[PDB]
Amino acid sequence: PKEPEQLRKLFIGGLSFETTDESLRSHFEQWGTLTDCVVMRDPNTKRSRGFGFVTYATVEEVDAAMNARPHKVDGRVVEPKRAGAHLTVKKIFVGGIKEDTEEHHLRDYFEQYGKIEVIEIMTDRGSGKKRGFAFVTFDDHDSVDKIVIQKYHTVNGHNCEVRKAL
């Protein structure tokens, strides 16, 4: 049973205008089987629009491609992002953690999504009591993208609500 195709796609921005379906495929096939690979072009001139997309057979292949960044494709460093525009952020809100969840609980869980730079457990301005939510900042947006597409996050026994934070 295959993962939904939307979760297997990478949008690739910043392409060289010389990149073709074939050269984009040859590059990204290093990290998995590509079921689709397209450079977007103008319908009249055929000139590249400077972006395209690739679709891998599995989510683990998407992960492998993202972990191999930076990608230099046909001499230009490109910008891959997983899948209406992408809100590219490095920080998440984590809600539902109650008063007993500590920094190490959040670190031990979230560090497997990406490199953590900041963990902020929110406390009440007046009393110092924990408010039951936190923010985690990573060094890169793909961590957040992987996190927010999961249906569930269980941290310190709590079913958590996790969203992109601006």
Ligand SMILES: CS(=O)(=O)NCCc1ccccc1
């Ligand atoms: C094969 S790759 O494209 O994933 N990495 C090539 C090395 C490189 C990347 C970015 C800038 C300069 C060099």
